[PDB]
Amino acid sequence: VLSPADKTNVKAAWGKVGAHAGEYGAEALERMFLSFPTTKTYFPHFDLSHGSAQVKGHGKKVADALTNAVAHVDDMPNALSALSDLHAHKLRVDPVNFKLLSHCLLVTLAAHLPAEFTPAVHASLDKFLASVSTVLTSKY
Amino acid sequence: VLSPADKTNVKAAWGKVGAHAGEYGAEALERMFLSFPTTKTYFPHFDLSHGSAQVKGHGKKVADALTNAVAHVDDMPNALSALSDLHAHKLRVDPVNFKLLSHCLLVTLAAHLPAEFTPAVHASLDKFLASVSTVLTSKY
Amino acid sequence: VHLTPEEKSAVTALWGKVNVDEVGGEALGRLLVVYPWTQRFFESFGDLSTPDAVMGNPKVKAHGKKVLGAFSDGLAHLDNLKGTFATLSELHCDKLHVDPENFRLLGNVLVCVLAHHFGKEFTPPVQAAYQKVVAGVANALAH
Amino acid sequence: VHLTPEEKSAVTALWGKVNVDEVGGEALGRLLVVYPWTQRFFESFGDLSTPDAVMGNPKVKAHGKKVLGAFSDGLAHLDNLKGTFATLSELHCDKLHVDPENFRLLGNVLVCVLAHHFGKEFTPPVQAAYQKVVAGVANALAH
Ligand code: HEM
Ligand code: HEM
Ligand code: HEM
Ligand code: HEM
């Protein structure tokens, strides 16, 4: 459950992220693939090398999903219903992988926005990514 | 996030639990203390022996809270607010301990209701206890 | 796993009354039902949509018999769990890519199944010794 | 922890540019802020209500210097992590009752702090090497 203060923090942080979302998501996916090779088994049809166009496109898709989740923070379960059905019913992704991807997104945000990544902003982003991860792993 | 089906399953299961809630909660607390001794550090003022009146009373309170959560499944954050502030702000309990207590409650329910503990009922109770644990581990 | 003589005697006595052919499959099916993401590893077992189809699966039953036989082999070598579960650890880590938390989940499901099948006989101390046994098994597998 | 020569060279070079006196305390403060249940352990330190009070605590800064010094001692003995962190593991398991997941959380917070301080030169390979290093440290502490 999120408060108003951290919701405002995530909204401001992602608004300041802005148009770099696609490259940030691609870099986060690359970091997840490089540091957690077990997650590579979920993408056997992808080319998982550095600078891959498929990874860049999937990162752009993930970034757009994060942007619309930020826009719909108060009503996540039904705003991300298609993704929840994709990840839980079809893909059957372990929530550990969601935790790893959230950690890699946090690392990317820290490495790209030092002034933006305050300790309060870090906590707000952490629990926002936990809320997106729980919605996408929920099966209902 | 819970579906209507597992919500109905938990409602029926706890309605059939009924008046044995206090004994079941006391036994669950005893099981948690015996199998996970690290949780005993959260109760330094209690007498944690077998058949203890303090443990029986605390189990009765926990069972009453669980019954209230069952009666208020759709609005847990607003129904368990006092307990959320108690466990998250004052007590500051690790969610691992909540997971252990949920597992011990599941073991107690399995040992006391064979006919009631169907595999679907088990899944519904697991998700219900995860939802109560998440509400009591969140900060507002 | 370090256990008292009383705990070891209690664990072995409960294990003798264990109906492996049923309880192993029951534990595997309950894992698949309560934690549906585990069906990714068992998609080759056929129909796993409904709990009744999961519990009526001969492949699930046979795999549960094999998982329980490993649990019995580990119980017979409680002082050598790491060496007993080395080939299985390699198979689960390098070949199957199973997350170690799933081992703890399966151990908890097995404990719940034992409680369901034994009732009052599965007392809080017996549950504690069994929890130590399944934690040791999970740690040996995750190595 | 097994590392390639390139990974070890990258890890050691970044560690030399690390400001211990700052980043150890900042990592501890970020752990306390993002995971507030960890303040149960740090109650002696004093005011830990607001993030600005957590990050401006001399006791938190000193304890973060000690935690980073242990991380440096572990980095200097990457092939003997289990034997290096034996006393710390005993202290954290028997005297402090700290859950092992908190070690992984602190390692992730430290990695985030390193990323925040090193920006672009914290490449994904460096992050992977540091992730497996902190994972080995957490495993040595949890033993
Ligand atoms: C944590 C936040 C996540 C978000 C916001 C997210 C979002 C998305 C989006 C937008 C798609 C595109 C679906 C489509 O184009 O049809 C997708 C697909 C997919 N996701 Fe995620 N995802 C997340 C986590 C994960 C994780 C951690 C994994 C695996 C470790 C994963 C595995 C997949 C896979 C395998 C696909 C299929 C892509 C394809 O077939 O091209 N997801 N996700
Ligand atoms: C579903 C899970 C839980 C429920 C429904 C629950 C419910 C309750 C209730 C009703 C009380 C009584 C508060 C009062 O009388 O003022 C309480 C107190 C308390 N709870 Fe929990 N609790 C849960 C989990 C836990 C766990 C896992 C722990 C520790 C490992 C814990 C630690 C405590 C402590 C230390 C108290 C104070 C009791 C006292 O001071 O007498 N709670 N909880
Ligand atoms: C204490 C926990 C576990 C034990 C003792 C155990 C034991 C075993 C055993 C005895 C086998 C048979 C290997 C063979 O016949 O060569 C096996 C295979 C396998 N295990 Fe496990 N296992 C455990 C946990 C898990 C979990 C939790 C999963 C998945 C979520 C899993 C996935 C698999 C799969 C997919 C196979 C191969 C099945 C097949 O090829 O038909 N294991 N395991
Ligand atoms: C994960 C890597 C960790 C490292 C390298 C580490 C390192 C250390 C060291 C070197 C000490 C000795 C301090 C002294 O002798 O004065 C210490 C003490 C302590 N540790 Fe850790 N620690 C870690 C994780 C944690 C975590 C995650 C927590 C709590 C959530 C924790 C709680 C404590 C506490 C409470 C003390 C005693 C502080 C005091 O008495 O003032 N440790 N740690």
Author numbering:
A (entry chain A), B (entry chain C): 1 to 140
C (entry chain D), D (entry chain B): 1 to 143
Q: What text appears in the publication on this structure?
A:
Here, we present a workflow that utilizes the SPT Labtech chameleon – a next-generation nanospray cryoEM grid preparation device – in an aerobic environment to freeze O2-sensitive proteins under functionally anaerobic conditions, which we term (an)aerobic. Demonstrating the utility of this workflow, we determined high-resolution cryoEM structures of deoxygenated human hemoglobin (Hb) in various liganded states and the molybdenum-iron protein (MoFeP) – the O2-sensitive catalytic component of Azotobacter vinelandii nitrogenase – in a reduced state. Our workflow maintains (an)aerobic samples by protecting against or eliminating O2 contamination prior to loading into the chameleon, during sample aspiration, and throughout sample deposition on self-wicking EM grids, respectively. Finally, we detail the effects of O2 contamination at different stages of the workflow and show how to prevent their effects. Together, we demonstrate reproducible high-resolution structure determination of O2-sensitive proteins of varying complexity and size – as small as 64 kDa – with a workflow requiring only minimal modifications to a robust, widely available EM grid freezing method.
As monitored by UV-Vis spectroscopy, metHb has a Soret maximum at 405 nm, indicating that the heme iron is in an oxidized state (Fe3+) and incapable of binding O2. To eliminate these possibilities, we next assessed the effect of the protective oil layer on grid preparation and downstream cryoEM imaging and data processing using our metHb sample. Briefly, we created two metHb samples – one without and one with the protective oil layer – by placing 15 µL of metHb (~ 125 µM) each into two sample cups. One sample was used without modification (non-oiled), and ~ 70 µL of aerobic Al’s oil was carefully layered over the second sample up to the brim of the sample cup (oiled). Two cryoEM grids of each sample were prepared using the chameleon following recommended guidelines. Both metHb samples were imaged using the same microscope parameters with approximately the same number of micrographs for each dataset collected. We did not observe any noticeable differences neither in the quality of the sample stripes on the grids nor in their behavior during data collection. Both datasets were processed independently but with similar steps and parameters to allow for a direct comparison of the resulting densities. A comparison of our 2.78-Å resolution non-oiled and 2.71-Å resolution oiled metHb EM densities did not indicate any notable differences in their overall quality. Indeed, the view distribution and the total number of particles were similar between the samples, each resolved to a similar resolution and demonstrated similar map-to-model validation metrics. D, E Comparison of metHb densities determined with or without the protective Al’s oil layer detailing no obvious differences in the metHb densities between the sample with oil present or not.
